[PDB]
Amino acid sequence: MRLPDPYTNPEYPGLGFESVNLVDNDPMIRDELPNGKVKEVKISAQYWGINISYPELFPDEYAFLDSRLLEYKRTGDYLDVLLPQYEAFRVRGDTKSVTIPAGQKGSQIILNTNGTLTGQPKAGDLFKLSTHPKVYKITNFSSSGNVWNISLYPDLFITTTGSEKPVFNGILFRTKLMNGDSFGSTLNNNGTYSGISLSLRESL
C-alpha cells in the first residue's frame, strides 16, 4: 500500500512531505579500550528510518490521509514511501535480461548487464533487488565492460539465487508505521488539523 503523496494525489497538496528524515539505524556494540583503539561489533540488522512531517491539513486532506492510515491499520499491510530526491532516472532498459550470479552473500553485487541497460548508476543512489524488500544504497560502482560491480551499504540480507533482478528506478520503502499505538491529531477551532507526524520504520 502506497502512502499518499502529491505524485498520485496532487489534489491534496497538504499531503506533501514538508521534511523527510532518512535515519541510518545500524545498532553496534562499540567498546573503547584504554590503549586508544576503538572496537565495534555488529550483530543486529540495519533498517532505514523515515520520519515524515506535515503542515496544517484541511478536512478533506486529513480525511483522505486518515482513511488510508486506518486502512493500513485494518489490513495490517505495509506502507510504501517514495522519496522524490532519490528518483533520478539513470539506468534505463529491461531488467529481465540481466543476470546476477548466485551465491553472493557479502556486501557487493556483481551482475552482467548483457548490454541491455543504458547509462550507469551513480554512487549514493538507491538500489534494490526484485525478490527482497530491503533497500540498498550504492556506495561505489565500477564497470568493466558489461559486468557491473555495485557496492551496497547494508550487507546483503539474502543470498542471491540467480533469479533476482536489480531494480534501480521506482524504489519504495516497505515501511511499517511506528508510534501508531498513540496516534492522534488535534482539530483547531479554525477547521484545520495540526500535529500530524509519521514515524516510519523499514519492516522488511
Binding site: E18, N190, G191
Partner: protein
C-alpha cells in the same frame, strides 16, 4: 516600444465565469515579487563571498483598490465575496463564518496592446470606507497567491459600475434620536484569512504559489468621531461612560450600516475643540450587522 500607464488600464474581476469590470476606480496599487532562499556557505576551507540563492516561491501579492460608490451597486459584491449573506440589497454579517476557506476569484489588470497581469486565487480581506464631509469611497484590499502574464483576458463590457452617487451628509442615530456634532464616521469590515503554506520537498527546483487559505475571523467595526457636546449639567444621554448594549445606525442617503446592539467605548481628546471618539463593535448576542445599499430613492 509599449509603455504601461496606470491611467490607461482596466481592472476586471473574474468570478463564477463572469467579468466584473470595476469602473469608477479612483486609484489602485499592486506589486509582484518572488521569494528567495539565499544562504552563504562560508567554510574554514573557503571563506566564500558568493551566495547560493535560488528563487523557489512567489510572494503573495497585496492589491488595494479605491472604488467610488455607483448607482448599479456592483461594489456590494465585495461584501458578497468577502462572506456576507445577501437578502435583497442588504448584506448581513453572519453569526458564524460560513466556510473554512474564503471565496476565491481571479482578477485581471488590462492594458493596451494585449498586455495583462493575471492575479489568481484572490480573496477580499479588507473593506473600509469613511462617511465624512468628502465623497465616500471604499478601499478594498485583496491578497493574491499567483500572479502571471497573459496575452488574452476577460473584459467586462456589460457588467460595469454606473455613475458615481452624489454626496450626502452622514448621520448617526440611536434608535431614532440623532447624535449631535458628527465629524467623521469610519466603518471597517475584514475577513482576516491566512495563507496555508504547503511548500514540500516535492516542490524542490520549482516555483511555489500559495493556493489555499482559511478564515481566522470576520468582524464589523466602526470608529465614530464627535465633538464633546453636553446639553445639561450631569447629562445622562451624552457622557463618557461605556455603553454595553445600545442600538446604533450610521445612516446616509445611499447606505446605512446597522448595529442592532453595539458596545461603545468613548475617548475624550482635549484638543482645540474637545472631541470624543467612539469605538463601536457589535455585542456577543447582537443580531447580524446590516449593510444596506440604496441606489436611488432608497
Amino acid at each position: 516600444m509599449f509603455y504601461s500607464l496606470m491611467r490607461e488600464s482596466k481592472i476586471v474581476i473574474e468570478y463564477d465565469g463572469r467579468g466584473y469590470h470595476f469602473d469608477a476606480l479612483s486609484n489602485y496599487d499592486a506589486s509582484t515579487s518572488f521569494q528567495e532562499f539565499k544562504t552563504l556557505r562560508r567554510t574554514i576551507h573557503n571563506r566564500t563571498n558568493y551566495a547560493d540563492s535560488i528563487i523557489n516561491a512567489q510572494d503573495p501579492s497585496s492589491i488595494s483598490l479605491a472604488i467610488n460608490f455607483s448607482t448599479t451597486l456592483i461594489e456590494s459584491n465585495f461584501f458578497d465575496w468577502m462572506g456576507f449573506t445577501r437578502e435583497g440589497n442588504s448584506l448581513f454579517l453572519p453569526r458564524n463564518t460560513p466556510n473554512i476557506e474564503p471565496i476565491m476569484f481571479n482578477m485581471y489588470i488590462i492594458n493596451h496592446n494585449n498586455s495583462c497581469i493575471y492575479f489568481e486565487n484572490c480573496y477580499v480581506s479588507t473593506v473600509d470606507f469613511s462617511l465624512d464631509k468628502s465623497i465616500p469611497i471604499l478601499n478594498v484590499g485583496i491578497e493574491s497567491g499567483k500572479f502571471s502574464e497573459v496575452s488574452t483576458f476577460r473584459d467586462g463590457y456589460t457588467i460595469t459600475q454606473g455613475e458615481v452617487l452624489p454626496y450626502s451628509a452622514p448621520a448617526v442615530y440611536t434608535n431614532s434620536s440623532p447624535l449631535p456634532a458628527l465629524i467623521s464616521a469610519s466603518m471597517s469590515f475584514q475577513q482576516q484569512c491566512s495563507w496555508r503554506e504547503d511548500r514540500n520537498i516535492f516542490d524542490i527546483n520549482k516555483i511555489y504559489t500559495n493556493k489555499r487559505a482559511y478564515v481566522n475571523e470576520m468582524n464589523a467595526s466602526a470608529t465614530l468621531a464627535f465633538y464633546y457636546v453636553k446639553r445639561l449639567v450631569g447629562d445622562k444621554f451624552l457622557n463618557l461612560d461605556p455603553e454595553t448594549r445600545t442600538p446604533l445606525i450610521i445612516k446616509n442617503k445611499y447606505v446605512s450600516i446597522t448595529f442592532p446592539l453595539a458596545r461603545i467605548s468613548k475617548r475624550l481628546n482635549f484638543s482645540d475643540l474637545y472631541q470624543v471618539e467612539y469605538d463601536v463593535i457589535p455585542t456577543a448576542d447582537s443580531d447580524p450587522v446590516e449593510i444596506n445599499f440604496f441606489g436611488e430613492r432608497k
